Short mmCIF file of C-alpha atoms and ligand atoms in Angstrom, two decimals:
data_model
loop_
_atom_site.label_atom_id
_atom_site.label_comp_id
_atom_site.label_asym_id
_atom_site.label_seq_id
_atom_site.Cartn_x
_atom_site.Cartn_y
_atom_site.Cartn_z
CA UNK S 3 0.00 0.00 0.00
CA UNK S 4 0.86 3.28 -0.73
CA UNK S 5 2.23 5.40 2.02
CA UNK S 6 0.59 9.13 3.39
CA UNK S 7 4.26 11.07 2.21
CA UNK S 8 3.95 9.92 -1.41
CA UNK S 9 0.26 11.65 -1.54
CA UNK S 10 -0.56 14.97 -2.53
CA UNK S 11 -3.83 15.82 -0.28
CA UNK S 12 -6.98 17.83 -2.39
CA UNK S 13 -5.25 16.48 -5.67
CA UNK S 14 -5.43 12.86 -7.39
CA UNK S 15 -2.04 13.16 -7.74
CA UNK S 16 1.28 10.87 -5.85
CA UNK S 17 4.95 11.15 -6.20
CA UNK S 18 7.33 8.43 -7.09
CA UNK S 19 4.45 5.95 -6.18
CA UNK S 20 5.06 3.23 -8.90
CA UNK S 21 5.59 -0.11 -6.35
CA UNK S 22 2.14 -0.42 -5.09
CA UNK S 23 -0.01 -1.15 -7.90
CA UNK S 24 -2.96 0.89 -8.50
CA UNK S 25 -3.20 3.54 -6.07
CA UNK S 26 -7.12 4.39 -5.32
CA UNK S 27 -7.90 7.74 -6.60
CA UNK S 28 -4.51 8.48 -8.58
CA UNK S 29 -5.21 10.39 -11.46
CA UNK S 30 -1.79 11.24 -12.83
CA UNK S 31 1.81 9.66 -11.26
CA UNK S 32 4.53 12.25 -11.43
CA UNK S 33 8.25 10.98 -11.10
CA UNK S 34 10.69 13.37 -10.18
CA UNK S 35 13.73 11.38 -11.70
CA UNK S 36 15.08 8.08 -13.05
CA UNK S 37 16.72 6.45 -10.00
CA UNK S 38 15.64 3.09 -9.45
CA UNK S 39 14.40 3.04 -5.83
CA UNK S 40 11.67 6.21 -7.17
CA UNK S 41 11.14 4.16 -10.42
CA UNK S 42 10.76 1.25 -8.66
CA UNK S 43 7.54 -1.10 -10.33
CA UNK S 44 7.54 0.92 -13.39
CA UNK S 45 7.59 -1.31 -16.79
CA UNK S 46 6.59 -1.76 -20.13
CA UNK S 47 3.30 -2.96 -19.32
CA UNK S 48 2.11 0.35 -17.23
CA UNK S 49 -1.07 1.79 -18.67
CA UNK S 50 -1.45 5.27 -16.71
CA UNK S 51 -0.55 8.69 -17.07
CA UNK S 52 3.47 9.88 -15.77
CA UNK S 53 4.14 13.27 -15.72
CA UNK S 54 8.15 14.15 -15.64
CA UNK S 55 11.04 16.11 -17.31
CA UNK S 56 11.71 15.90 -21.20
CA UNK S 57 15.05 13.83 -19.94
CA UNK S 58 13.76 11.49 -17.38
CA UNK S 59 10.51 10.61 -20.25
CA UNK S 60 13.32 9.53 -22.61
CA UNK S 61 14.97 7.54 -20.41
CA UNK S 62 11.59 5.72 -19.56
CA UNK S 63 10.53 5.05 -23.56
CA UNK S 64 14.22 3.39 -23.92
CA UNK S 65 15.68 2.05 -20.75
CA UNK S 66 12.16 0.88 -19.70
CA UNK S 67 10.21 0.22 -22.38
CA UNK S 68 7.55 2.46 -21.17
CA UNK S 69 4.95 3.22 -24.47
CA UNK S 70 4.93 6.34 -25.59
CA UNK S 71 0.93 7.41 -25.01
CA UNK S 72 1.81 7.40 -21.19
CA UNK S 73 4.59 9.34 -21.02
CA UNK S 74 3.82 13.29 -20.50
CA UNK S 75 6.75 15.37 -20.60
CA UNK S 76 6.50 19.23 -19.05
CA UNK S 77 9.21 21.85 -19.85
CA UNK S 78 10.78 23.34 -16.71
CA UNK S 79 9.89 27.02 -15.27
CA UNK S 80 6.57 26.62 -16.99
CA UNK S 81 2.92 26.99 -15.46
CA UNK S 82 1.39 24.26 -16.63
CA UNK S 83 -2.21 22.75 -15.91
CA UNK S 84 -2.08 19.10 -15.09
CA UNK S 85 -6.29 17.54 -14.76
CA UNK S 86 -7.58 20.76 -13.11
CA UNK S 87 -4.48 21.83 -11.48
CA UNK S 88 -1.72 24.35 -11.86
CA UNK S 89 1.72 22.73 -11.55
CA UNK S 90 5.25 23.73 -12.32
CA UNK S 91 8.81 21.87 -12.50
CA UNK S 92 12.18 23.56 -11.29
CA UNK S 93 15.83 21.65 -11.60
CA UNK S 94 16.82 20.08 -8.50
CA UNK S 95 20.74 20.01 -9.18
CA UNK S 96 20.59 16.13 -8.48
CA UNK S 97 21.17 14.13 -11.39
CA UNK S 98 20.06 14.61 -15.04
CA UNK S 99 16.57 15.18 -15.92
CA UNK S 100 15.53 15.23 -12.11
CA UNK S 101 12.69 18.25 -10.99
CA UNK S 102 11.33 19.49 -7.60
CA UNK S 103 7.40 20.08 -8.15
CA UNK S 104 5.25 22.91 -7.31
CA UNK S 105 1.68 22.11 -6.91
CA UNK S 106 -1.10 25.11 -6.91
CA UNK S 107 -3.90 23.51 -4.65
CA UNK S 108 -7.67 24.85 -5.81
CA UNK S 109 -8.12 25.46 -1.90
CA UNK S 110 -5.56 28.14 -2.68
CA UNK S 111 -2.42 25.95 -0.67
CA UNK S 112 0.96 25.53 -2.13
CA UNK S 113 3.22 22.47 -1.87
CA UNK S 114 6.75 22.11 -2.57
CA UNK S 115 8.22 18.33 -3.14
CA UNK S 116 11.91 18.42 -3.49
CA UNK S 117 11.92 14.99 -5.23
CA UNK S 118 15.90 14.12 -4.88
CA UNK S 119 17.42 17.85 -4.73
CA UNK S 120 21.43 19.31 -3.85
CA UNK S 121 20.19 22.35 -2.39
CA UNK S 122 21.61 25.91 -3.78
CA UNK S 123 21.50 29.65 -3.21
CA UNK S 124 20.52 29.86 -7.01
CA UNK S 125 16.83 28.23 -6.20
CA UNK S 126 16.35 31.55 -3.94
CA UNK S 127 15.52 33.19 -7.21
CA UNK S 128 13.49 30.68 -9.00
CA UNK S 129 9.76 30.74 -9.56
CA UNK S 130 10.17 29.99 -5.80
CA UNK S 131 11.28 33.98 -5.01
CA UNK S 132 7.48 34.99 -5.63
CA UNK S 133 5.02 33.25 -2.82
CA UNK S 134 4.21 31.39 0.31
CA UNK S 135 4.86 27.92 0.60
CA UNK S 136 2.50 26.00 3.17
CA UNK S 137 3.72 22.93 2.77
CA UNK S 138 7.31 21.40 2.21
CA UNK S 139 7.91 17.88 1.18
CA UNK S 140 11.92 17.44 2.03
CA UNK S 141 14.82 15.21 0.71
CA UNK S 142 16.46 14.66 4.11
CA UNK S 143 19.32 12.31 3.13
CA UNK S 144 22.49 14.13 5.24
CA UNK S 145 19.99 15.82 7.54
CA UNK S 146 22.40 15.72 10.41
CA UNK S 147 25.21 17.73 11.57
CA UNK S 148 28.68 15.73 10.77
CA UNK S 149 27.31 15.87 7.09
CA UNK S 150 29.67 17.30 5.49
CA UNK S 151 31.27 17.39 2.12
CA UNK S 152 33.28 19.77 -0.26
CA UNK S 153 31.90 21.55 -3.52
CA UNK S 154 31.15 19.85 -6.50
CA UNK S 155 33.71 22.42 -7.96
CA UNK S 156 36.38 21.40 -5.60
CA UNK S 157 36.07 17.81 -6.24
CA UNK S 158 36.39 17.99 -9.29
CA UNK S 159 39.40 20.15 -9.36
CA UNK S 160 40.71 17.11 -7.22
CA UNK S 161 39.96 14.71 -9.59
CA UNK S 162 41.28 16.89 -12.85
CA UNK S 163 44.75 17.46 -10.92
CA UNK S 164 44.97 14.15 -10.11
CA UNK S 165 44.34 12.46 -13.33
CA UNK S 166 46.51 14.95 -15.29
CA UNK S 167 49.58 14.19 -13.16
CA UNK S 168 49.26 11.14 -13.01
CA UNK S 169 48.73 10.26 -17.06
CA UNK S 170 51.44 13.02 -18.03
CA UNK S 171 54.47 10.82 -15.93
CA UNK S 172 52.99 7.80 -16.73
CA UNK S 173 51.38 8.07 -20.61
CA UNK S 174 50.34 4.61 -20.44
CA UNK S 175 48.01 5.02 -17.56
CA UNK S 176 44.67 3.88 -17.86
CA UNK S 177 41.72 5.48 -16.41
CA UNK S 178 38.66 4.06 -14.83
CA UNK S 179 35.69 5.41 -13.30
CA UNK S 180 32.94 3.79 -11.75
CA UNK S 181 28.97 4.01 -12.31
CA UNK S 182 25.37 2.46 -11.29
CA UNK S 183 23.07 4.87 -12.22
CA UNK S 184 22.95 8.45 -13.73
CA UNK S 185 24.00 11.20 -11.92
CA UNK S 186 28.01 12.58 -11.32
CA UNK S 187 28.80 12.42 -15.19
CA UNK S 188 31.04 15.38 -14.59
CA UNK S 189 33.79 13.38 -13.17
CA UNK S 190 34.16 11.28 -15.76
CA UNK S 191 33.57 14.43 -18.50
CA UNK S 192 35.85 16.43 -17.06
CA UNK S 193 38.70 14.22 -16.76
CA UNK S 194 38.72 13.00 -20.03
CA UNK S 195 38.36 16.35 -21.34
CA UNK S 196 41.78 17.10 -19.50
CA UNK S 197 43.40 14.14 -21.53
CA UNK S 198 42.15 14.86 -24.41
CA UNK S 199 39.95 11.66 -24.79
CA UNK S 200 36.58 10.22 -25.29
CA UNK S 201 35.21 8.26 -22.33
CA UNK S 202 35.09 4.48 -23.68
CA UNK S 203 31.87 2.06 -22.15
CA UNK S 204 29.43 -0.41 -22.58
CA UNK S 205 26.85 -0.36 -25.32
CA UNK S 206 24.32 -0.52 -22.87
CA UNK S 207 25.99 2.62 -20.90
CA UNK S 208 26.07 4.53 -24.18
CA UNK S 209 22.48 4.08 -24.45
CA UNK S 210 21.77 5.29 -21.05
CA UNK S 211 24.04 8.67 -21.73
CA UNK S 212 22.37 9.22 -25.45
CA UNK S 213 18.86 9.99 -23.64
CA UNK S 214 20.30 12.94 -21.45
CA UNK S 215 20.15 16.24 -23.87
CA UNK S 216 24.34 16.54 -23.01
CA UNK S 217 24.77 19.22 -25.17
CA UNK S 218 27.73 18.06 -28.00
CA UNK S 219 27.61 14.64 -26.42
CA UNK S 220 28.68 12.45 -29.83
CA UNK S 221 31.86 14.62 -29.24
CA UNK S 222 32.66 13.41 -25.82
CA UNK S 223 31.66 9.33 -25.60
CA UNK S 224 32.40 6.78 -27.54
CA UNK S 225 31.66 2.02 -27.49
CA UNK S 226 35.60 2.11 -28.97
CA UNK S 227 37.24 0.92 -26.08
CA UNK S 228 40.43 0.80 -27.88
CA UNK S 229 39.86 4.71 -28.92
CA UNK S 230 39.79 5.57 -25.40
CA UNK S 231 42.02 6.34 -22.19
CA UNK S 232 39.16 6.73 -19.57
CA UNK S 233 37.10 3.61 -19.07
CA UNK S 234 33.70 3.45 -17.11
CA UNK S 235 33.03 -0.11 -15.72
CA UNK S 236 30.17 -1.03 -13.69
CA UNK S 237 30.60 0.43 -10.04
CA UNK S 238 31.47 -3.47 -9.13
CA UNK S 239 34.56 -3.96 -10.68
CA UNK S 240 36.45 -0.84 -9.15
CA UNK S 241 38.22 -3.03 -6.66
CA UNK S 242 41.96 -4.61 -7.45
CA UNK S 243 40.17 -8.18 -8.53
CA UNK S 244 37.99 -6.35 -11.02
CA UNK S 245 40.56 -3.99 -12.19
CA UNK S 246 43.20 -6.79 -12.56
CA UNK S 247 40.85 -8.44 -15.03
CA UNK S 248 40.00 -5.31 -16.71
CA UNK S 249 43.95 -4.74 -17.33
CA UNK S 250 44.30 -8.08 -19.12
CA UNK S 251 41.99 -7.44 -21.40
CA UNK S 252 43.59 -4.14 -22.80
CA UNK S 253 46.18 -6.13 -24.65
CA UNK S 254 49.13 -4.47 -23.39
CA UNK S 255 47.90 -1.05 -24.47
CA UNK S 256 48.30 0.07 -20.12
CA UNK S 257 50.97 -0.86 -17.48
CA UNK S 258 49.01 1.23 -14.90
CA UNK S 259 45.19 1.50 -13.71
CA UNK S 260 44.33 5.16 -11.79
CA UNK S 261 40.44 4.59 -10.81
CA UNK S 262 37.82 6.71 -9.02
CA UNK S 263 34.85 5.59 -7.13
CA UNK S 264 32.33 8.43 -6.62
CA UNK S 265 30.60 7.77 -3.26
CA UNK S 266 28.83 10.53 -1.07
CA UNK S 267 29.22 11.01 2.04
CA UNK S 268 31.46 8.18 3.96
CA UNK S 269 33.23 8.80 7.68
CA UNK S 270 36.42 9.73 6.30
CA UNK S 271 34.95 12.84 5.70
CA UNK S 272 34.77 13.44 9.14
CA UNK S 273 38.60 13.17 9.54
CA UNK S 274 40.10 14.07 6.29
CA UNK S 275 40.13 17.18 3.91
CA UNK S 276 39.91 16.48 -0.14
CA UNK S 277 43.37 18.00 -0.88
CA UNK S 278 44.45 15.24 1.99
CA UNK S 279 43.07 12.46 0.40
CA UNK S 280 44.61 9.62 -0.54
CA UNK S 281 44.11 6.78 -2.60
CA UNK S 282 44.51 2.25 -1.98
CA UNK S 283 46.97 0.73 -3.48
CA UNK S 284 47.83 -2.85 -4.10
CA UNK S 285 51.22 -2.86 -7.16
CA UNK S 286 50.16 -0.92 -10.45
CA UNK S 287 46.42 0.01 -9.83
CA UNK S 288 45.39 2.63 -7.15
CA UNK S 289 41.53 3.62 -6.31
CA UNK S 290 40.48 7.23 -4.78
CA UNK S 291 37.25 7.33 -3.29
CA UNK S 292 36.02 11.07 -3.89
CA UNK S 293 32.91 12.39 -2.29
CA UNK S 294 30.92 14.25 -5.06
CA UNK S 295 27.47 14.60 -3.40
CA UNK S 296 23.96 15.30 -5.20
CA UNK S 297 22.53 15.96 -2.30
CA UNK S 298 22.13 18.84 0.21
CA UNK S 299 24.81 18.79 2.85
CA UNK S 300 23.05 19.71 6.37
CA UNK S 301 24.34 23.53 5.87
CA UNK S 302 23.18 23.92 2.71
CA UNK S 303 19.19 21.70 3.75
CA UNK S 304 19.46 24.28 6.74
CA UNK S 305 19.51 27.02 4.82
CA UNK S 306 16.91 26.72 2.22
CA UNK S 307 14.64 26.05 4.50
CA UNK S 308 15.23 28.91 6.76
CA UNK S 309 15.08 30.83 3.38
CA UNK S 310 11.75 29.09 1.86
CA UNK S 311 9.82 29.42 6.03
CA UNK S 312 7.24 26.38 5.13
CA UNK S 313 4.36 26.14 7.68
CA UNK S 314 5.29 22.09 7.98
CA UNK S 315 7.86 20.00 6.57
CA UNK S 316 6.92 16.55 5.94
CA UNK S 317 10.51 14.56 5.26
CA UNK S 318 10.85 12.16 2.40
CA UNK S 319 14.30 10.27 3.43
CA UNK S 320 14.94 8.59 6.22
CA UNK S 321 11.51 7.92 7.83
CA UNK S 322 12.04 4.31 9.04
CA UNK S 323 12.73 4.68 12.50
CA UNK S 324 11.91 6.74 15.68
CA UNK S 325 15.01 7.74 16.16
CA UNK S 326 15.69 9.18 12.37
CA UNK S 327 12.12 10.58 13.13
CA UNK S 328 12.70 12.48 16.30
CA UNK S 329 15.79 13.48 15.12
CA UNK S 330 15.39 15.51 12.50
CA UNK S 331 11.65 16.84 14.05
CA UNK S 332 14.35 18.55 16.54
CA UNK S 333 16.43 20.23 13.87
CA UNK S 334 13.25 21.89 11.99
CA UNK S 335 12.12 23.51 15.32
CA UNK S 336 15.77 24.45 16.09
CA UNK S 337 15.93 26.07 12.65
CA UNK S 338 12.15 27.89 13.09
CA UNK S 339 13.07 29.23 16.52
CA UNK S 340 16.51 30.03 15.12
CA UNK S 341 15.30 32.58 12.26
CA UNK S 342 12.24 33.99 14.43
CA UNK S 343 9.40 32.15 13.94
C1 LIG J 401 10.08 23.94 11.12
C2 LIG J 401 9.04 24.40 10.16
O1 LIG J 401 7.99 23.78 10.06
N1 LIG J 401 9.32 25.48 9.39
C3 LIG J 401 10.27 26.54 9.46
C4 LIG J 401 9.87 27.86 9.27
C5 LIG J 401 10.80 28.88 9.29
C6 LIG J 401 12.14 28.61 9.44
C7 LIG J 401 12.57 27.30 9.59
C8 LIG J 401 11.64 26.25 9.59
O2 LIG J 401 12.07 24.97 9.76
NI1 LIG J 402 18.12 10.11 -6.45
#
């Protein structure tokens, strides 16, 4: 059965609600973006209306054979009426194709759902700038203090320096980077662009990376493995086993394997600074872990929603246990009393 935080209340509408069949009363099932625990039950054989970004409805037609009279697509920063209702999307700086959702109640309410969002200063002068917000509907992922993580920017300065070094004393360095879902393309991107190489993959990858609207993207990817210096593997293989085996079947093209595995947050980051981070090693193949989060860090959750004021926040991430629960029920009301409300 579906559960009270994927409803929207006065509408026929749910969010990422695809795992419990039909949903009594659902007129129209919006999904804010293609990860697989949102997705989750949605197949080729689903016969009601979705309502998503332009990217995330490509990525249903050809990753999961959704048919194409189902799938809605809405632009972004666009009012748009939806059975009866006014709705609009705004980007959530999370992974490709992935929206927050603004919902114009008739009873004259407004409801923000932050789907999966990284939380920025820029979204202070959305659509969002202009009225009140009675409702918020939160991705609390790293809603805790000791969550904590660099820049996007910074990490990937980390990884660009890193890469560059290490391929210009040893040019017959391969590297890998490891994936299991969209989201984080820029460290792979940006590293290759540094080289001066296509990223090499799977045909299946490719696929995946041809339904995201990456603007010159036939310029930047490639299934020639042999073309190629940077490799993406399934996140799986980035460990020495997987790597080893990956090696052998270059032909003697590489003596060397440099490979990053994009995590978020882990407790190193409670220790350690990124310029102080340092890789495992095991002979000629090293692996960095990097943290390059799309998701709000607790500083950056805090202050959104000290920003945005919502009359009651209703988290989305999680909402398991008791604990989790009374937890971050605690932060909100330090945050309201906080900015004087
Ligand atoms: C706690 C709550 O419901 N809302 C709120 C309102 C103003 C500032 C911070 C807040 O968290
Ligand atoms: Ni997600």
């Amino acid at each position: 059965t579906c559960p009270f935080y994927k409803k929207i209340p006065g509408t026929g509408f749910t969010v990422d609600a695809f795992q419990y069949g039909v949903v009594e009363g659902c007129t129209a099932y919006f999904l804010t973006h293609f990860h697989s625990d949102h997705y989750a039950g949605l197949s080729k054989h689903f016969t009601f209306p979705v309502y998503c970004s332009e990217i995330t409805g490509n990525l249903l037609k050809n990753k999961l054979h959704v048919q194409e009279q189902y799938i809605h697509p809405l632009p972004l920063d666009t009012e748009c009426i939806v059975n009866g209702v006014k709705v609009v999307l705004l980007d959530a700086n999370h992974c490709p194709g992935a929206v927050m959702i603004l919902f114009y109640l008739p009873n004259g309410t407004v409801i923000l759902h932050t789907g999966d969002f990284r939380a920025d200063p820029s979204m202070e002068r959305s659509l969002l700038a202009d009225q009140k917000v009675h409702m918020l509907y939160l991705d609390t992922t790293y809603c805790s203090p000791e969550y904590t993580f660099p820049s996007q920017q910074e990490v990937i300065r980390f990884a660009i320096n890193t890469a560059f070094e290490a391929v210009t004393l040893n040019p017959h360095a391969l590297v890998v980077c490891g994936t299991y879902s969209i989201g984080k393309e820029k460290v792979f991107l940006a590293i290759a662009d540094v080289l001066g190489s296509k990223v090499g993959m799977s045909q299946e990858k490719y696929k995946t990376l041809q339904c995201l609207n990456i603007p010159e993207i036939n310029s930047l990817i490639t299934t020639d493995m042999c073309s190629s210096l940077v490799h993406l593997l399934p996140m799986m293989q980035i460990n020495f086993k997987g790597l080893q085996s990956h090696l052998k079947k270059c032909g003697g093209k590489y003596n060397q394997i440099l490979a990053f595995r994009p995590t978020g947050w882990t407790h190193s980051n409670k220790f350690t600074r990124i310029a102080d981070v340092i890789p495992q090693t095991k002979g000629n193949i090293s692996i960095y872990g990097i943290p390059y989060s799309e998701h709000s860090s607790y500083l950056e959750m805090k202050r959104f929603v000290q920003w945005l004021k919502p009359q009651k926040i209703i988290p989305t991430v999680n909402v398991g246990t008791w604990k989790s629960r009374s937890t971050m029920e605690k932060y909100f009301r330090e945050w309201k009393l906080e900015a004087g409300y």
